[PDB]
């Protein structure tokens, strides 16, 4: 056999792509990794959840996605990420199911055929890769889902900039599956690249 089936909040390396696989809720979702930039998730009747591969140190990487996303309710496609100082997460969301993410609006940018909103939020008393904290979070959410193409990192970094939304240091980026609550599954691979 070979591919591996992990149900504990763990980060590491498999098959020379960074994971983080994380939730509050265990035993009621699981990731399974696949070759290369490739993950599965399944998903029932769950809390919170945060799963994907990518890199344990983001940046400006133009990347390429394909997935299978087949959420019952809420749940995100995502390239999410993190910095530190200032600790701060942010996602791109290409794809949602029950529930668009928005926050305060400020503005758009026009990438890779589409158009985003840009939202800021706050987050307090969360976890993070910090341990429990207050911070922001900032926003790219797609006008219309996707669930494959390419995403230049880059412009949205810099739109997000435009708007005063500042980025520290970079820890890890991966393409996320996200949920909250109800069921779901999906496959999703990922690589540098346009």
Same mark, same amino acid.
């Given at each position: 056999?070979?591919? $591996? $089936?992990?149900?504990?909040?763990?980060?590491?390396?498999?098959?020379?792509?960074?994971?983080?696989? &994380? $939730?509050?809720?265990?035993?009621?979702?699981?990731?399974? =990794?696949? %070759? /290369?930039?490739?993950?599965?998730?399944?998903?029932?009747?769950? +809390?919170?959840? @945060?799963?994907?591969? +990518?890199?344990?140190?983001?940046?400006? *990487?133009? @990347?390429?996605?394909?997935?299978?996303?087949?959420? %019952?309710?809420?749940?995100?496609?995502? =390239? !999410?990420? &993190?910095?530190?100082?200032? =600790?701060?997460?942010?996602?791109?969301?290409?794809? &949602?199911?029950?529930?668009?993410?928005?926050?305060? !609006?400020?503005?758009?940018?026009?990438?890779? +055929? /589409?158009?985003?909103?840009?939202?800021?939020?706050? *987050?307090?008393?969360?976890?993070? #890769?910090? /341990?429990?904290?207050?911070?922001?979070?900032?926003?790219?959410?797609?006008?219309?889902? *996707?669930?494959?193409?390419? #995403?230049? #990192?880059?412009?949205?970094?810099?739109? &997000?900039? *435009?708007?005063?939304?500042?980025? /520290?240091?970079?820890?890890?980026? #991966?393409?996320?599956?996200?949920?909250?609550?109800?069921?779901?599954?999906?496959?999703? %691979?990922?690589?540098? +690249?346009?």
């Amino acid at each position: 056999g070979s591919d $591996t $089936t992990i149900t504990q909040n763990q980060t590491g390396y498999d098959n020379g792509y960074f994971y983080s696989f &994380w $939730t509050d809720a265990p035993g009621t979702v699981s990731m399974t =990794l696949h %070759s /290369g930039g490739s993950y599965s998730t399944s998903w029932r009747n769950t +809390g919170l959840f @945060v799963a994907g591969k +990518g890199w344990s140190t983001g940046g400006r *990487r133009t @990347v390429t996605y394909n997935a299978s996303f087949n959420p %019952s309710g809420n749940a995100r496609l995502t =390239l !999410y990420g &993190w910095t530190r100082g200032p =600790l701060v997460s942010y996602h791109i969301v290409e794809s &949602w199911g029950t529930y668009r993410p928005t926050g305060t !609006y400020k503005g758009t940018v026009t990438t890779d +055929g /589409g158009t985003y909103d840009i939202y800021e939020t706050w *987050r307090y008393n969360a976890p993070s #890769i910090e /341990g429990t904290r207050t911070y922001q979070q900032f926003w790219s959410v797609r006008q219309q889902k *996707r669930t494959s193409g390419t #995403i230049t #990192i880059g412009n949205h970094f810099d739109a &997000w900039a *435009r708007a005063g939304m500042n980025l /520290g240091s970079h820890d890890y980026q #991966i393409m996320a599956t996200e949920g909250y609550q109800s069921s779901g599954s999906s496959t999703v %691979s990922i690589s540098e +690249g346009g």
